[PDB]
Design an enzyme around this catalytic site. Structure first.
Site, PDB file in Angstrom:
ATOM      1  N   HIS A 179       0.801  -1.133  -0.024  1.00 18.23           N
ATOM      2  CA  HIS A 179      -0.106   0.182   0.087  1.00 18.23           C
ATOM      3  C   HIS A 179       0.988   1.220  -0.139  1.00 18.23           C
ATOM      4  O   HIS A 179       1.270   1.786   1.197  1.00 18.23           O
ATOM      5  CB  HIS A 179      -0.923   0.035   1.231  1.00 18.23           C
ATOM      6  CG  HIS A 179      -2.016   1.157   1.134  1.00 18.23           C
ATOM      7  ND1 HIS A 179      -1.985   2.018   0.128  1.00 18.23           N
ATOM      8  CD2 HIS A 179      -3.285   1.244   1.691  1.00 18.23           C
ATOM      9  CE1 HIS A 179      -3.178   2.894   0.325  1.00 18.23           C
ATOM     10  NE2 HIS A 179      -3.842   2.084   1.039  1.00 18.23           N
ATOM     11  N   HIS A 182      -2.670   6.690  -0.911  1.00 18.55           N
ATOM     12  CA  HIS A 182      -3.814   7.422  -0.239  1.00 18.55           C
ATOM     13  C   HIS A 182      -3.093   8.113   1.148  1.00 18.55           C
ATOM     14  O   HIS A 182      -3.910   7.962   2.016  1.00 18.55           O
ATOM     15  CB  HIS A 182      -4.793   6.232   0.118  1.00 18.55           C
ATOM     16  CG  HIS A 182      -5.428   5.691  -0.993  1.00 18.55           C
ATOM     17  ND1 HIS A 182      -6.088   4.607  -1.082  1.00 18.55           N
ATOM     18  CD2 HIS A 182      -5.190   6.172  -2.379  1.00 18.55           C
ATOM     19  CE1 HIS A 182      -6.539   4.337  -2.330  1.00 18.55           C
ATOM     20  NE2 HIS A 182      -5.952   5.570  -3.187  1.00 18.55           N
ATOM     21  N   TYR A 184      -0.738   6.773   3.218  1.00 21.41           N
ATOM     22  CA  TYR A 184      -0.173   6.016   4.093  1.00 21.41           C
ATOM     23  C   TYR A 184       1.130   6.447   4.305  1.00 21.41           C
ATOM     24  O   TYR A 184       1.791   6.931   3.400  1.00 21.41           O
ATOM     25  CB  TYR A 184      -0.818   4.611   4.143  1.00 21.41           C
ATOM     26  CG  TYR A 184      -2.405   4.700   4.307  1.00 21.41           C
ATOM     27  CD1 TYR A 184      -2.672   5.534   5.630  1.00 21.41           C
ATOM     28  CD2 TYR A 184      -3.367   4.697   3.660  1.00 21.41           C
ATOM     29  CE1 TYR A 184      -4.120   5.555   5.907  1.00 21.41           C
ATOM     30  CE2 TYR A 184      -4.580   4.787   3.562  1.00 21.41           C
ATOM     31  CZ  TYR A 184      -4.968   5.126   4.812  1.00 21.41           C
ATOM     32  OH  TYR A 184      -6.596   5.407   5.042  1.00 21.41           O
TER      33      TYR A 184
HETATM   34  C1  FMN Z   1     -15.010   1.849   2.328  1.00 16.79           C
HETATM   35  C2  FMN Z   1     -14.004   2.163   1.523  1.00 16.79           C
HETATM   36  C3  FMN Z   1     -12.902   1.508   1.908  1.00 16.79           C
HETATM   37  C4  FMN Z   1     -11.740   1.430   1.374  1.00 16.79           C
HETATM   38  N1  FMN Z   1     -10.560   1.103   1.908  1.00 16.79           N
HETATM   39  C5  FMN Z   1      -9.391   0.981   0.970  1.00 16.79           C
HETATM   40  C6  FMN Z   1      -8.139   0.150   1.404  1.00 16.79           C
HETATM   41  O1  FMN Z   1      -8.139  -0.567   2.253  1.00 16.79           O
HETATM   42  N2  FMN Z   1      -7.005   0.388   0.622  1.00 16.79           N
HETATM   43  C7  FMN Z   1      -7.103   1.004  -0.463  1.00 16.79           C
HETATM   44  O2  FMN Z   1      -5.943   0.969  -1.284  1.00 16.79           O
HETATM   45  N3  FMN Z   1      -8.062   1.539  -0.886  1.00 16.79           N
HETATM   46  C8  FMN Z   1      -9.280   1.432  -0.249  1.00 16.79           C
HETATM   47  N4  FMN Z   1     -10.385   2.317  -0.818  1.00 16.79           N
HETATM   48  C9  FMN Z   1     -10.275   3.018  -2.124  1.00 16.79           C
HETATM   49  C10 FMN Z   1     -10.859   1.551  -2.874  1.00 16.79           C
HETATM   50  O3  FMN Z   1      -9.979   0.466  -3.214  1.00 16.79           O
HETATM   51  C11 FMN Z   1     -11.381   2.303  -4.478  1.00 16.79           C
HETATM   52  O4  FMN Z   1      -9.848   2.738  -5.018  1.00 16.79           O
HETATM   53  C12 FMN Z   1     -12.225   3.361  -4.443  1.00 16.79           C
HETATM   54  O5  FMN Z   1     -13.360   2.749  -3.699  1.00 16.79           O
HETATM   55  C13 FMN Z   1     -12.597   3.959  -5.615  1.00 16.79           C
HETATM   56  O6  FMN Z   1     -13.103   3.096  -6.640  1.00 16.79           O
HETATM   57  P1  FMN Z   1     -14.836   2.926  -6.734  1.00 16.79           P
HETATM   58  O7  FMN Z   1     -15.357   4.059  -7.373  1.00 16.79           O
HETATM   59  O8  FMN Z   1     -15.073   1.600  -7.402  1.00 16.79           O
HETATM   60  O9  FMN Z   1     -15.406   2.462  -5.340  1.00 16.79           O
HETATM   61  C14 FMN Z   1     -11.506   2.146  -0.058  1.00 16.79           C
HETATM   62  C15 FMN Z   1     -12.658   2.701  -0.557  1.00 16.79           C
HETATM   63  C16 FMN Z   1     -13.884   2.485   0.224  1.00 16.79           C
HETATM   64  C17 FMN Z   1     -15.151   3.302  -0.296  1.00 16.79           C
END
Ligand code: FMN
Length: 362
Positions: A179, A182, A184
Protein backbone atom coordinates in the site's frame (compact mmCIF):
# COMPACT_ATOMS: atom_id res chain seq x y z
CA UNK A 1 -15.56 -8.18 -24.47
CA UNK A 2 -12.06 -8.29 -23.10
CA UNK A 3 -13.22 -7.79 -19.50
CA UNK A 4 -14.12 -11.49 -19.26
CA UNK A 5 -10.91 -12.91 -20.70
CA UNK A 6 -8.01 -14.31 -18.69
CA UNK A 7 -4.91 -12.39 -17.62
CA UNK A 8 -1.63 -13.63 -16.14
CA UNK A 9 -0.87 -11.59 -13.01
CA UNK A 10 2.62 -12.66 -11.99
CA UNK A 11 2.41 -16.23 -10.73
CA UNK A 12 -1.42 -16.36 -10.89
CA UNK A 13 -3.86 -16.53 -13.79
CA UNK A 14 -7.03 -14.54 -13.33
CA UNK A 15 -10.01 -15.81 -15.37
CA UNK A 16 -11.31 -12.28 -15.94
CA UNK A 17 -10.19 -8.66 -15.58
CA UNK A 18 -12.83 -7.61 -12.99
CA UNK A 19 -10.92 -7.26 -9.73
CA UNK A 20 -12.10 -6.49 -6.22
CA UNK A 21 -10.32 -3.39 -4.96
CA UNK A 22 -8.92 -3.30 -1.41
CA UNK A 23 -11.69 -2.16 0.93
CA UNK A 24 -11.20 -1.33 4.59
CA UNK A 25 -14.33 -2.52 6.43
CA UNK A 26 -13.14 -2.34 10.11
CA UNK A 27 -14.83 -5.52 11.34
CA UNK A 28 -11.84 -7.27 12.93
CA UNK A 29 -11.68 -8.47 16.54
CA UNK A 30 -10.03 -6.37 19.23
CA UNK A 31 -7.90 -7.08 21.18
CA UNK A 32 -5.62 -8.68 18.62
CA UNK A 33 -6.79 -7.14 15.28
CA UNK A 34 -7.89 -10.63 14.30
CA UNK A 35 -9.78 -11.45 11.09
CA UNK A 36 -13.03 -13.34 11.56
CA UNK A 37 -15.14 -16.07 9.95
CA UNK A 38 -17.59 -13.34 8.95
CA UNK A 39 -14.78 -11.73 6.94
CA UNK A 40 -14.06 -15.16 5.51
CA UNK A 41 -17.68 -15.44 4.32
CA UNK A 42 -17.57 -11.96 2.74
CA UNK A 43 -14.45 -12.83 0.76
CA UNK A 44 -15.80 -16.25 -0.23
CA UNK A 45 -18.94 -14.59 -1.62
CA UNK A 46 -16.72 -12.54 -3.95
CA UNK A 47 -14.44 -15.39 -5.10
CA UNK A 48 -15.56 -15.13 -8.76
CA UNK A 49 -13.52 -11.91 -8.99
CA UNK A 50 -10.57 -12.20 -11.31
CA UNK A 51 -8.54 -11.30 -8.23
CA UNK A 52 -9.64 -10.27 -4.73
CA UNK A 53 -7.36 -7.69 -3.13
CA UNK A 54 -7.96 -7.68 0.60
CA UNK A 55 -8.64 -4.80 2.91
CA UNK A 56 -5.50 -3.04 4.03
CA UNK A 57 -3.76 -5.13 6.67
CA UNK A 58 -1.14 -4.13 9.22
CA UNK A 59 2.44 -5.31 8.83
CA UNK A 60 2.99 -4.76 12.59
CA UNK A 61 1.23 -3.35 15.62
CA UNK A 62 2.93 0.00 15.01
CA UNK A 63 1.37 0.03 11.53
CA UNK A 64 -2.17 0.25 12.95
CA UNK A 65 -4.11 3.45 12.37
CA UNK A 66 -7.76 2.28 12.42
CA UNK A 67 -9.66 0.35 15.08
CA UNK A 68 -11.00 -2.81 13.46
CA UNK A 69 -8.45 -3.16 10.67
CA UNK A 70 -6.71 -6.57 10.67
CA UNK A 71 -3.05 -7.40 11.05
CA UNK A 72 -0.72 -10.01 9.56
CA UNK A 73 2.00 -9.97 12.21
CA UNK A 74 0.81 -12.25 15.03
CA UNK A 75 0.28 -16.02 15.21
CA UNK A 76 -3.44 -15.59 15.82
CA UNK A 77 -3.76 -13.28 12.79
CA UNK A 78 -1.90 -15.76 10.59
CA UNK A 79 -4.12 -18.63 11.75
CA UNK A 80 -7.29 -16.64 11.05
CA UNK A 81 -6.17 -15.53 7.59
CA UNK A 82 -5.23 -19.13 6.75
CA UNK A 83 -8.90 -20.05 7.16
CA UNK A 84 -9.99 -17.09 5.01
CA UNK A 85 -7.66 -17.83 2.11
CA UNK A 86 -8.56 -21.55 2.27
CA UNK A 87 -12.20 -20.60 1.92
CA UNK A 88 -11.51 -18.42 -1.12
CA UNK A 89 -9.45 -21.21 -2.70
CA UNK A 90 -12.24 -23.71 -2.06
CA UNK A 91 -14.43 -21.46 -4.27
CA UNK A 92 -11.72 -21.38 -6.95
CA UNK A 93 -10.81 -17.76 -6.20
CA UNK A 94 -7.52 -15.90 -5.92
CA UNK A 95 -6.69 -13.42 -3.14
CA UNK A 96 -3.92 -10.88 -2.57
CA UNK A 97 -3.31 -9.21 0.78
CA UNK A 98 -2.83 -5.48 0.77
CA UNK A 99 -0.17 -4.61 3.33
CA UNK A 100 0.11 -1.17 4.90
CA UNK A 101 1.69 0.92 7.54
CA UNK A 102 -0.56 3.85 8.26
CA UNK A 103 2.22 6.16 9.46
CA UNK A 104 0.82 9.47 10.59
CA UNK A 105 -2.77 8.59 9.59
CA UNK A 106 -3.36 7.17 13.03
CA UNK A 107 -4.03 7.97 16.66
CA UNK A 108 -1.85 7.47 19.73
CA UNK A 109 -4.58 5.55 21.58
CA UNK A 110 -4.18 2.58 19.20
CA UNK A 111 -0.38 2.64 18.97
CA UNK A 112 1.98 0.43 21.04
CA UNK A 113 2.42 2.06 24.42
CA UNK A 114 -0.05 4.75 23.46
CA UNK A 115 2.69 6.76 21.79
CA UNK A 116 2.56 9.11 18.84
CA UNK A 117 2.52 7.34 15.45
CA UNK A 118 5.55 7.55 13.16
CA UNK A 119 6.10 9.22 9.82
CA UNK A 120 8.69 10.72 7.50
CA UNK A 121 8.35 14.03 9.34
CA UNK A 122 6.61 15.43 12.43
CA UNK A 123 3.62 16.80 10.49
CA UNK A 124 -0.01 16.11 11.43
CA UNK A 125 -2.14 14.53 8.72
CA UNK A 126 -4.87 17.10 9.44
CA UNK A 127 -7.62 14.57 8.91
CA UNK A 128 -9.44 11.83 10.81
CA UNK A 129 -9.05 8.11 11.37
CA UNK A 130 -11.63 5.63 12.65
CA UNK A 131 -11.49 4.42 16.26
CA UNK A 132 -14.10 2.46 18.19
CA UNK A 133 -16.24 3.79 21.03
CA UNK A 134 -17.03 1.94 24.25
CA UNK A 135 -19.82 0.05 22.45
CA UNK A 136 -17.49 -1.06 19.64
CA UNK A 137 -18.93 1.25 17.00
CA UNK A 138 -16.81 3.17 14.52
CA UNK A 139 -16.15 6.86 15.24
CA UNK A 140 -14.01 9.39 13.36
CA UNK A 141 -11.26 11.04 15.44
CA UNK A 142 -8.63 13.64 14.59
CA UNK A 143 -5.16 12.24 13.83
CA UNK A 144 -2.30 12.54 16.33
CA UNK A 145 0.83 14.46 15.34
CA UNK A 146 3.53 11.91 14.46
CA UNK A 147 7.16 11.55 15.43
CA UNK A 148 9.70 11.56 12.61
CA UNK A 149 11.42 8.22 12.18
CA UNK A 150 15.10 8.20 13.01
CA UNK A 151 17.44 6.93 10.31
CA UNK A 152 18.29 3.87 12.42
CA UNK A 153 14.60 2.93 12.57
CA UNK A 154 14.14 2.68 8.79
CA UNK A 155 15.62 -0.85 8.47
CA UNK A 156 13.07 -2.07 10.99
CA UNK A 157 10.23 -0.73 8.84
CA UNK A 158 11.66 -2.57 5.83
CA UNK A 159 12.00 -5.74 7.88
CA UNK A 160 8.40 -5.43 9.06
CA UNK A 161 7.22 -5.41 5.44
CA UNK A 162 9.53 -8.38 4.70
CA UNK A 163 8.23 -10.37 7.68
CA UNK A 164 4.64 -9.54 6.81
CA UNK A 165 5.25 -10.96 3.32
CA UNK A 166 6.69 -14.16 4.78
CA UNK A 167 3.53 -14.31 6.91
CA UNK A 168 1.30 -13.63 3.90
CA UNK A 169 2.87 -16.46 1.91
CA UNK A 170 2.40 -18.77 4.89
CA UNK A 171 -1.20 -17.57 5.29
CA UNK A 172 -1.99 -18.75 1.78
CA UNK A 173 -2.34 -15.49 -0.13
CA UNK A 174 -1.63 -15.72 -3.84
CA UNK A 175 -0.04 -12.25 -4.07
CA UNK A 176 0.85 -9.25 -1.91
CA UNK A 177 -0.05 -5.63 -2.71
CA UNK A 178 2.11 -2.98 -1.04
CA UNK A 179 0.00 0.00 0.00
CA UNK A 180 2.03 2.91 -1.38
CA UNK A 181 -1.01 5.15 -1.87
CA UNK A 182 -3.61 7.31 -0.16
CA UNK A 183 -1.40 9.16 2.30
CA UNK A 184 -0.15 6.15 4.30
CA UNK A 185 3.42 5.64 5.37
CA UNK A 186 5.03 4.81 2.03
CA UNK A 187 3.19 7.67 0.31
CA UNK A 188 4.18 9.98 3.21
CA UNK A 189 7.80 9.39 2.20
CA UNK A 190 7.08 9.73 -1.54
CA UNK A 191 5.32 13.09 -1.22
CA UNK A 192 7.29 16.34 -0.75
CA UNK A 193 4.31 17.68 1.18
CA UNK A 194 4.59 15.14 3.99
CA UNK A 195 8.31 14.45 3.70
CA UNK A 196 10.51 17.35 4.83
CA UNK A 197 13.47 15.15 5.73
CA UNK A 198 16.99 16.25 4.88
CA UNK A 199 18.71 12.82 4.99
CA UNK A 200 18.89 10.20 2.24
CA UNK A 201 15.13 9.54 2.67
CA UNK A 202 14.00 13.05 1.71
CA UNK A 203 14.60 15.83 -0.78
CA UNK A 204 15.20 14.41 -4.24
CA UNK A 205 12.69 12.05 -5.82
CA UNK A 206 15.36 9.36 -5.62
CA UNK A 207 15.56 9.84 -1.86
CA UNK A 208 11.78 10.11 -1.46
CA UNK A 209 11.31 6.82 -3.31
CA UNK A 210 14.16 5.11 -1.46
CA UNK A 211 12.01 3.55 1.25
CA UNK A 212 9.37 2.12 -1.07
CA UNK A 213 12.07 0.70 -3.38
CA UNK A 214 13.93 -0.84 -0.39
CA UNK A 215 10.60 -2.40 0.63
CA UNK A 216 10.00 -3.69 -2.89
CA UNK A 217 13.49 -5.21 -3.01
CA UNK A 218 13.10 -6.80 0.41
CA UNK A 219 9.73 -8.40 -0.37
CA UNK A 220 10.84 -9.63 -3.82
CA UNK A 221 13.80 -11.31 -2.12
CA UNK A 222 11.62 -12.82 0.61
CA UNK A 223 9.14 -14.34 -1.85
CA UNK A 224 9.41 -13.69 -5.62
CA UNK A 225 8.93 -10.61 -7.80
CA UNK A 226 6.02 -12.33 -9.57
CA UNK A 227 4.11 -12.36 -6.27
CA UNK A 228 4.44 -8.62 -5.56
CA UNK A 229 2.15 -5.81 -6.63
CA UNK A 230 2.10 -2.17 -5.54
CA UNK A 231 -0.70 0.34 -5.25
CA UNK A 232 0.13 3.98 -5.95
CA UNK A 233 -1.97 7.14 -6.09
CA UNK A 234 0.65 9.38 -7.68
CA UNK A 235 -1.45 12.06 -9.42
CA UNK A 236 -3.61 14.35 -7.34
CA UNK A 237 -4.28 14.69 -3.61
CA UNK A 238 -5.38 11.79 -1.38
CA UNK A 239 -6.28 12.25 2.28
CA UNK A 240 -4.49 15.62 2.29
CA UNK A 241 -1.26 14.21 0.84
CA UNK A 242 -0.49 15.75 -2.58
CA UNK A 243 2.20 14.47 -4.95
CA UNK A 244 4.24 17.64 -5.09
CA UNK A 245 4.75 20.10 -7.91
CA UNK A 246 6.38 17.60 -10.29
CA UNK A 247 3.95 14.74 -9.79
CA UNK A 248 3.98 13.32 -13.34
CA UNK A 249 7.79 13.29 -13.66
CA UNK A 250 8.15 11.84 -10.16
CA UNK A 251 5.57 9.15 -10.89
CA UNK A 252 7.37 8.09 -14.05
CA UNK A 253 10.66 7.85 -12.16
CA UNK A 254 9.11 5.52 -9.59
CA UNK A 255 7.39 3.43 -12.26
CA UNK A 256 10.64 3.02 -14.22
CA UNK A 257 12.38 1.85 -11.05
CA UNK A 258 9.59 -0.57 -10.18
CA UNK A 259 9.74 -2.01 -13.69
CA UNK A 260 13.39 -2.95 -13.11
CA UNK A 261 12.27 -5.36 -10.37
CA UNK A 262 9.91 -7.30 -12.66
CA UNK A 263 7.02 -7.13 -10.20
CA UNK A 264 3.68 -8.65 -11.00
CA UNK A 265 1.60 -5.49 -11.18
CA UNK A 266 1.14 -1.72 -10.82
CA UNK A 267 -2.25 -0.70 -9.39
CA UNK A 268 -3.08 2.99 -9.94
CA UNK A 269 -5.72 4.61 -7.74
CA UNK A 270 -6.64 7.46 -10.02
CA UNK A 271 -8.94 9.53 -7.82
CA UNK A 272 -10.56 9.67 -4.41
CA UNK A 273 -14.31 9.57 -3.95
CA UNK A 274 -14.71 13.32 -4.51
CA UNK A 275 -13.18 13.06 -7.96
CA UNK A 276 -10.70 15.13 -9.87
CA UNK A 277 -9.18 15.56 -13.26
CA UNK A 278 -8.87 12.39 -15.35
CA UNK A 279 -5.52 10.92 -16.29
CA UNK A 280 -4.45 12.13 -19.73
CA UNK A 281 -4.01 9.61 -22.51
CA UNK A 282 -0.44 10.84 -22.88
CA UNK A 283 0.31 10.05 -19.24
CA UNK A 284 -1.26 6.59 -19.57
CA UNK A 285 0.95 5.99 -22.62
CA UNK A 286 4.07 7.08 -20.70
CA UNK A 287 3.22 4.66 -17.88
CA UNK A 288 2.54 1.80 -20.28
CA UNK A 289 5.84 2.14 -22.13
CA UNK A 290 7.79 2.08 -18.87
CA UNK A 291 6.10 -0.78 -17.05
CA UNK A 292 6.07 -4.33 -18.39
CA UNK A 293 3.71 -6.00 -15.95
CA UNK A 294 -0.01 -5.82 -15.39
CA UNK A 295 -1.54 -2.37 -14.93
CA UNK A 296 -4.74 -2.19 -12.87
CA UNK A 297 -6.83 0.98 -13.01
CA UNK A 298 -9.21 2.05 -10.25
CA UNK A 299 -11.35 5.00 -9.21
CA UNK A 300 -14.96 5.49 -10.24
CA UNK A 301 -14.55 3.16 -13.22
CA UNK A 302 -17.41 1.82 -15.26
CA UNK A 303 -17.30 -1.44 -17.19
CA UNK A 304 -17.41 0.69 -20.36
CA UNK A 305 -14.40 2.79 -19.34
CA UNK A 306 -12.49 -0.38 -18.44
CA UNK A 307 -13.25 -1.98 -21.80
CA UNK A 308 -12.21 1.20 -23.60
CA UNK A 309 -8.82 1.43 -21.89
CA UNK A 310 -8.16 -2.32 -22.10
CA UNK A 311 -9.00 -2.23 -25.79
CA UNK A 312 -6.63 0.70 -26.27
CA UNK A 313 -3.84 -1.32 -24.65
CA UNK A 314 -3.33 1.13 -21.81
CA UNK A 315 -4.43 -1.00 -18.81
CA UNK A 316 -5.01 -4.73 -18.30
CA UNK A 317 -7.61 -4.91 -15.53
CA UNK A 318 -9.92 -2.76 -13.43
CA UNK A 319 -10.49 -2.85 -9.70
CA UNK A 320 -13.99 -1.94 -8.50
CA UNK A 321 -14.50 -0.87 -4.91
CA UNK A 322 -18.03 0.17 -4.01
CA UNK A 323 -19.60 -2.00 -6.70
CA UNK A 324 -17.85 -5.01 -5.07
CA UNK A 325 -19.10 -4.02 -1.62
CA UNK A 326 -22.66 -4.28 -2.92
CA UNK A 327 -22.40 -7.02 -5.59
CA UNK A 328 -20.71 -10.30 -4.60
CA UNK A 329 -21.31 -11.57 -8.15
CA UNK A 330 -20.24 -8.38 -9.89
CA UNK A 331 -18.56 -10.42 -12.64
CA UNK A 332 -21.78 -12.18 -13.57
CA UNK A 333 -23.75 -8.93 -13.36
CA UNK A 334 -21.34 -7.10 -15.66
CA UNK A 335 -21.26 -10.05 -18.09
CA UNK A 336 -25.07 -10.22 -18.24
CA UNK A 337 -25.64 -6.44 -18.19
CA UNK A 338 -27.78 -6.90 -15.08
CA UNK A 339 -28.65 -4.17 -12.64
CA UNK A 340 -26.44 -3.71 -9.62
CA UNK A 341 -27.58 -3.85 -6.00
CA UNK A 342 -28.15 -0.51 -4.25
CA UNK A 343 -25.20 0.50 -2.09
CA UNK A 344 -25.63 1.18 1.65
CA UNK A 345 -22.75 3.51 2.60
CA UNK A 346 -23.72 3.75 6.25
CA UNK A 347 -22.43 0.18 6.72
CA UNK A 348 -19.17 0.48 4.78
CA UNK A 349 -17.14 0.98 7.98
CA UNK A 350 -17.59 -1.10 11.12
CA UNK A 351 -20.52 -3.07 12.40
CA UNK A 352 -21.41 -6.65 11.56
CA UNK A 353 -23.06 -8.77 8.90
CA UNK A 354 -25.60 -6.14 7.88
CA UNK A 355 -24.23 -4.23 4.89
CA UNK A 356 -21.40 -6.74 4.62
CA UNK A 357 -22.52 -10.30 3.85
CA UNK A 358 -26.19 -9.57 3.14
CA UNK A 359 -25.95 -8.20 -0.38
CA UNK A 360 -27.46 -10.81 -2.70
CA UNK A 361 -26.20 -12.43 -5.84
CA UNK A 362 -28.40 -12.56 -8.91
C1 FMN B 1 -15.20 1.85 2.26
C2 FMN B 1 -13.94 1.98 1.44
C3 FMN B 1 -12.78 1.40 1.91
C4 FMN B 1 -11.59 1.46 1.20
N1 FMN B 1 -10.45 0.93 1.71
C5 FMN B 1 -9.27 0.91 0.95
C6 FMN B 1 -8.15 0.22 1.34
O1 FMN B 1 -8.11 -0.46 2.39
N2 FMN B 1 -7.00 0.28 0.58
C7 FMN B 1 -6.98 1.02 -0.57
O2 FMN B 1 -5.92 1.06 -1.21
N3 FMN B 1 -8.10 1.65 -0.99
C8 FMN B 1 -9.26 1.58 -0.27
N4 FMN B 1 -10.38 2.23 -0.73
C9 FMN B 1 -10.36 2.80 -2.10
C10 FMN B 1 -10.89 1.69 -3.02
O3 FMN B 1 -9.96 0.58 -3.11
C11 FMN B 1 -11.18 2.19 -4.48
O4 FMN B 1 -9.94 2.55 -5.05
C12 FMN B 1 -12.18 3.32 -4.46
O5 FMN B 1 -13.30 2.74 -3.75
C13 FMN B 1 -12.66 4.01 -5.73
O6 FMN B 1 -13.25 3.09 -6.56
P1 FMN B 1 -14.83 2.80 -6.78
O7 FMN B 1 -15.46 4.03 -7.47
O8 FMN B 1 -14.86 1.58 -7.64
O9 FMN B 1 -15.42 2.56 -5.41
C14 FMN B 1 -11.57 2.11 -0.03
C15 FMN B 1 -12.74 2.69 -0.50
C16 FMN B 1 -13.92 2.63 0.22
C17 FMN B 1 -15.13 3.26 -0.34
Amino acid sequence: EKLFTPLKVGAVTAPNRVFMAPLTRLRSIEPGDIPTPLMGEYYRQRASAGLIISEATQISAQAKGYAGAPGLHSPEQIAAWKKITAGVHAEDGRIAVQLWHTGRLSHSSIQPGGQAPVSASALNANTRTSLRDENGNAIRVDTTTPRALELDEIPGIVNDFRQAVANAREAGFDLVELHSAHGYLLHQFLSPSSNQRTDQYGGSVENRARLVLEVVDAVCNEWSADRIGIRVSPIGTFQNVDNGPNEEADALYLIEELAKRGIAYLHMSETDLAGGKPYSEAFRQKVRERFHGVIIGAGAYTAEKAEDLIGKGLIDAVAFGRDYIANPDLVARLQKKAELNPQRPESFYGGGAEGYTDYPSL
